[PDB]
Amino acid sequence: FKGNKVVLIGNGAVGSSYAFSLVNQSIVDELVIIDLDTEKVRGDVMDLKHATPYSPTTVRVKAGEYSDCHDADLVVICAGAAQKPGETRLDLVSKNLKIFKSIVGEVMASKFDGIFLVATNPVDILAYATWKFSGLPKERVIGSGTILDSARFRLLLSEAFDVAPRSVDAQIIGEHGDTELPVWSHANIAGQPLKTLLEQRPEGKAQIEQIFVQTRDAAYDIIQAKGATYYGVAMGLARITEAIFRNEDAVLTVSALLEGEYEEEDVYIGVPAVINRNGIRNVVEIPLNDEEQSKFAHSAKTLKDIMAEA
Amino acid sequence: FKGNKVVLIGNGAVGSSYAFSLVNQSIVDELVIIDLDTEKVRGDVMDLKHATPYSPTTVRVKAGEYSDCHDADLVVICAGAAQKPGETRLDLVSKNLKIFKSIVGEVMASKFDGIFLVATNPVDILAYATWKFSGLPKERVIGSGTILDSARFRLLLSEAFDVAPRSVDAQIIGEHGDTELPVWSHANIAGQPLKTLLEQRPEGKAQIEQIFVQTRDAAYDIIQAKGATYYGVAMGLARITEAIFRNEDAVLTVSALLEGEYEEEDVYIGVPAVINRNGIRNVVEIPLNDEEQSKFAHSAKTLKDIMAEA
Amino acid sequence: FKGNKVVLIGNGAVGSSYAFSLVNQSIVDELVIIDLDTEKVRGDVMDLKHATPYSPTTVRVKAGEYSDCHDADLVVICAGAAQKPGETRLDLVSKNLKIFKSIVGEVMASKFDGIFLVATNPVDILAYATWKFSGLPKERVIGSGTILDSARFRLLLSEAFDVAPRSVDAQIIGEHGDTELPVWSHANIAGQPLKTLLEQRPEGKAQIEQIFVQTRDAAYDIIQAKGATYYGVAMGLARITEAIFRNEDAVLTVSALLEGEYEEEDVYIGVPAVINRNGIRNVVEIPLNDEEQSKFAHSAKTLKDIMAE
Amino acid sequence: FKGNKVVLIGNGAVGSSYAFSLVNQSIVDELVIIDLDTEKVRGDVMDLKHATPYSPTTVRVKAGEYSDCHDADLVVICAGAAQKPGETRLDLVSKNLKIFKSIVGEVMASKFDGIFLVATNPVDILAYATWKFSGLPKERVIGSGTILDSARFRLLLSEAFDVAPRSVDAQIIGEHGDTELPVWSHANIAGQPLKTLLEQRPEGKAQIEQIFVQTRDAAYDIIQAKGATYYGVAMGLARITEAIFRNEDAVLTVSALLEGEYEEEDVYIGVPAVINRNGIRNVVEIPLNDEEQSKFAHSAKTLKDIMAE
């Protein structure tokens, strides 16, 4: 009768913020933090523990090492390497593949038998890699994918239409990156057709474009302003964590393996998927219009070309 | 029929973390952030907004200016200045008093008529200053005081006795700083007398001391490890925010004005106090043993001497 | 600075269940319960108070009288009369209009200046009546409307498609009653067109029909089984209460006054509407297909005909 | 990887209220309800399901049978028989022991391997019986015990001292019944000695007595008023359910087996105990003053005498 245990690997801005989200939300009762910067870990674990008496229900937080993954239920990986000058995107992929082969190797050697949630960029490539490296079933390896992109799109639509973001149903699918796309054929508020309504406004076509540009380029915009982006990603990772531990069967946009859905295979990419205590139960195949079909196929090709090069 | 509006003044590590706590907890529906580093604000507001579609209920976040305090319900002040080399503690007090005279002045000029929650250190001095400067009733000016110290003490006791921190009732009172004290005469788990039990262990007296030292010196220890401390303070500020907006009549340890309680007057200092939608309803005067009476009086004197110098 | 105060008028199965929901959810910190059956109230208030120590945040519960509405924020009306044999619907309407004239009058005389949430059936008629009797702006008088019918439709769809109910976006609009209608033109899971998908199944048209019939006739089915229905209603009333007190600007299907929307006027009826701390901020006018336009107009006509009588 | 599954056996006012609490709180994602009154169950399950779309997170509710316990995590027993005229307490005990032997037997035969939470009165006796009949470790059989009596005591103290109930630390221990006792040596608000403070008030000894009498006799008072008590019990059962499923290591007053603690053995009785995902981790032995030691020993003797018969 063990409790719910998350191990976070990588304690930078995103991981540390996700850890604080867990302490606020009490999704699980045990959080273990692993990072090579063991002084930052020790300092963060103290600071987080001191918050926990005001957590809704008990959360225990500790510094850990790979062996602590033995009975972990979810391993969340935020660790990795940024692109350097003169490095090609292929170089950046190769560099993080080497890191992930090592991390996933150490996790599996602990006898871990839970679910992976990968957040490191490029997330769709690294989720695919974690699946291959770990030998686990596809249900048990999840990339965060477009979980945050979809939230950014909903946030911006909720400002354009002045309603709660929870009342906006809107999705970004595809690569978490340059090749993502908005699903305007479905974006709505209680049935209100948002793109059609925006097209009625003056320069409405320009507004539609700017809503998507601001979604696509959100990280770049936050980094220019404050140097790093982390709250939005932490909250999205908490949302997935919730769906798993509360066994929700909730449809979320995450990076999932396709084996025929959307006429694509052997690729991880952002799509709506049903999430529950066993991970991704199934990918949801929704209708796409011509423009969306075109863009989604191009995104998948982009991801598959990159991996093939590697 | 207006909603619940918090304005945060000061968007460093503590303020930004408190803002993220609010986005996780949905205590209030509107958060406004004010800081002279307007680029950091703009970047944080974007990053926070992107989390809000997964907030439990709607939270709107925006960058603001003093005029936005006009209809704010709670103004939370984290802004201030750290001590510099060659500066005496008196110098550090004088420097933050000048900043607070300015901030409080601008807030009041907006026609603000809500509650202040002060977090800037030295918090008991600056809460007293905010009370004087604002002209408001003492109920409506609250320092965070020992809200975090008490949580640190409970956290450490919950580790020593291996139970949920929510099942540990333990308090730190006095100055948030060197002169704080533990209330061992009351610290218990369901009636278990913790100090008495610790005294039964081998070198039990040394354990009692180390539990308090680690509480008192927690910030110093976190700063040596990761350079700054912020999660624990953010969570404590969220806890007070909750008691106010949910009208709880909850007893929390905060910095409150004494006008006769504990035989002290004309001083703000950390004590248990009943918190509700009108701020501090009353200070709770609990029995203190001789050692606690001695230490609390010395803490109050320390704070009053400092203010008198200023 | 006052806290958040709800007064419940009518402590039957629905109202008492709604009170328990409030004790579980801690949406507000004060609940006052008013009912002519003062012994049942005294009992419920004790039993409820004993739960409050485990409520997420403080909830104070007490037995009250009309004067306690003076500074209430939300007054929730579940009180009324059921239809008797040899009574027409018109008779049933008239009887409750008399009760509401009395209740709303006593509430207003207390100096109440908050929001009404009407739950008593026929809820669209009685919401309209409460608006008229109270003289308050339409924003501050809300009927529960199809808040539960919509949840029932989502529940049944969540079973037919095996997914979280929270991941089903689907709505019932119109009269809370015989003339309500499903908005199949909109009902979807992350963009999956539910009616279209059901029509691909064998006897799929029969399944579509049965999902709606089971939604429409849910209360009848529950009453036949256990003699009364109340948990669904209580939870829907708690959801509206949450949107108000947390100032959400959440779109919910409630009974709202139309003044031109959907080409209808001078009628309360179930529609998506933005709810916040001020009550109904605005009705949302969604596109309706031919079938839905037809059924919605018929529902509104039905309600206006009966009120005109 | 399985989700969290509770099976409720006994769908009376207490069990149905507990089910509604679970729908409000989303502590677990699956609830199965078993009762011989299968029409009431069918009705409650429909009404409850219709609330679930507004639950914080997915809650699936269904009508079930004993075989559904096979992979349940928690089985909550509210079923039983009330005392009849001309029946002694011993008769009442014997009748429920027969019912429990049957229920626990059918549960165990399903392959259930989780935790029992017994709520049926007399709860300390029936918790002990369930431990014996099930052959499970003591950690995995929990009676509700004084979970509600403690909340009642805190509620009344919160009224006498005008503060949040969550800020009152106070406990009732012993038999859930006539021999329960207040732990005044501990009861406090942030260190304020409540009994001492009450004794300073005029007729303060009378107030102290009345706070306890109203705690002890609460169910009687509620039954006299509205004929049954259920909200308090449901919320206490939900609080224990929360501590298990969120693995809290929370100290709660429940009915636990003593094997030496408080100098008592071979008896279940209400005591503070650490609760986590494994059930009762350990009983907490708190210091008791002379009066409390006397009353606690008497309560345990009362329970052991009746079981020995």
Curated annotation (Swiss-Prot), chains A, B:
It is found in: Cytoplasm. Coiled coil: none annotated. Its EC number is 1.1.1.27. Induction: By nitrosative stress and anaerobiosis. Expression is not detected during aerobic growth. It catalyses: (S)-lactate + NAD(+) = pyruvate + NADH + H(+). Pathway: Fermentation; pyruvate fermentation to lactate; (S)-lactate from pyruvate: step 1/1. One of its GO terms (molecular function) is L-lactate dehydrogenase activity. Keywords: Cytoplasm, NAD, Oxidoreductase, Phosphoprotein, Stress response. Signal peptide: none annotated. The active site is at residue 176. NAD(+) binds at residues 13-14, 35, 40, 66, 80-81, 102, 119-121, 144. GO terms for biological process: glycolytic process; lactate metabolic process. One of its GO terms (cellular component) is cytoplasm. Homotetramer. Belongs to the LDH/MDH superfamily. LDH family. HAMAP family: Lactate_dehydrog (MF_00488). Catalyzes the conversion of lactate to pyruvate (Potential). Appears to be the primary factor that allows S.aureus growth during nitrosative stress in both aerobically and anaerobically cultured cells. This is L-lactate dehydrogenase 1. It comes from Staphylococcus aureus (strain COL).
